[PDB]
Design an enzyme around this catalytic site. Structure first.
Site, mmCIF file in Angstrom:
data_model
loop_
_atom_site.group_PDB
_atom_site.id
_atom_site.type_symbol
_atom_site.label_atom_id
_atom_site.label_comp_id
_atom_site.label_asym_id
_atom_site.label_seq_id
_atom_site.Cartn_x
_atom_site.Cartn_y
_atom_site.Cartn_z
ATOM 1 N N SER A 1 28.693 -14.165 -14.245
ATOM 2 C CA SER A 1 29.631 -14.546 -13.208
ATOM 3 C C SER A 1 28.918 -14.469 -11.853
ATOM 4 C CB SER A 1 30.843 -13.618 -13.229
ATOM 5 O OG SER A 1 30.444 -12.281 -13.005
ATOM 6 N N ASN B 1 34.921 -12.536 -7.456
ATOM 7 C CA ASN B 1 34.170 -12.801 -8.674
ATOM 8 C C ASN B 1 34.772 -13.962 -9.473
ATOM 9 O OD1 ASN B 1 32.838 -12.584 -11.147
ATOM 10 N ND2 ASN B 1 32.877 -10.341 -11.126
ATOM 11 N N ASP C 1 29.708 -13.752 -7.466
ATOM 12 C CA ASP C 1 30.581 -13.290 -6.399
ATOM 13 C C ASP C 1 30.414 -14.182 -5.171
ATOM 14 O OD1 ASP C 1 31.282 -11.103 -8.057
ATOM 15 O OD2 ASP C 1 29.820 -9.794 -7.084
ATOM 16 N N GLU D 1 30.155 -5.836 1.347
ATOM 17 C CA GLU D 1 30.074 -6.898 0.354
ATOM 18 C C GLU D 1 29.187 -8.043 0.832
ATOM 19 O OE1 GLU D 1 30.908 -6.649 -2.561
ATOM 20 O OE2 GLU D 1 32.613 -5.285 -2.713
ATOM 21 N N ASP E 1 26.547 -10.345 -16.016
ATOM 22 C CA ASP E 1 27.304 -11.059 -17.038
ATOM 23 C C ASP E 1 27.332 -12.567 -16.829
ATOM 24 O OD1 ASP E 1 29.126 -11.481 -14.993
ATOM 25 O OD2 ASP E 1 30.801 -10.483 -15.979
ATOM 26 N N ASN F 1 26.030 -11.926 -10.997
ATOM 27 C CA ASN F 1 26.231 -10.691 -11.736
ATOM 28 C C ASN F 1 25.523 -10.777 -13.082
ATOM 29 O OD1 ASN F 1 28.086 -9.685 -9.703
ATOM 30 N ND2 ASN F 1 29.584 -11.139 -10.542
#
Ligand code: CL
Ligand code: CL
Ligand code: CL
Ligand code: NA
Ligand code: NA
Ligand code: RU
EC number: 3.2.1.17
Length: 129
Positions: free
Chosen positions: A50, A59, A52, A35, A48, A46
């Site tokens: 959002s 998220n 992380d 990650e 959309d 991301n």
């Protein structure tokens, strides 16, 4: 902060992640490796909208507030910035909630794709724990 492999294993074990919800320490270290490459300051946007955050790329759609993810929740009740600290407490406590949500560590797509079913014990091998 960029953790060393065994350094992060020790910190995660101290914070109660080893075998949390049945997931051995190596699973958590492997997830953190892919990650964030062990970097607490990692962020990634991301599609959309959002974002992380942190060692486990938690998220903003569900787990933390960053003020710029319309319609999102803040189920860990923390500013997403807390997930970037050198102190991993916020990331660990939020990950405990995430992994308890129903799908286990499959919540982390990278864990499913790169750690699940592998020799995750290799990630803690040699570490003084
Ligand atoms: Cl392990
Ligand atoms: Cl928001
Ligand atoms: Cl992946
Ligand atoms: Na949010
Ligand atoms: Na600590
Ligand atoms: Ru859910």
């Amino acid at each position: 902060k960029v953790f060393g492999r065994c350094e992060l294993a020790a910190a995660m074990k101290r914070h109660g992640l080893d075998n949390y919800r049945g997931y051995s320490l190596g699973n958590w270290v492997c997830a953190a490796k892919f990650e964030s490459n062990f970097n607490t300051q990692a962020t990634n946007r991301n599609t959309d909208g959002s974002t992380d955050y942190g060692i486990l790329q938690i998220n903003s759609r569900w787990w933390c507030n960053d003020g710029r993810t319309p319609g999102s929740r803040n189920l860990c009740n923390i500013p997403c910035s807390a997930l970037l600290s050198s102190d991993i407490t916020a990331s660990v406590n939020c990950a405990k909630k995430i992994v308890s949500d129903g799908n286990g560590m499959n919540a982390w797509v990278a864990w499913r794709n790169r750690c699940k079913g592998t020799d995750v014990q290799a990630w803690i091998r040699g570490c003084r724990l």
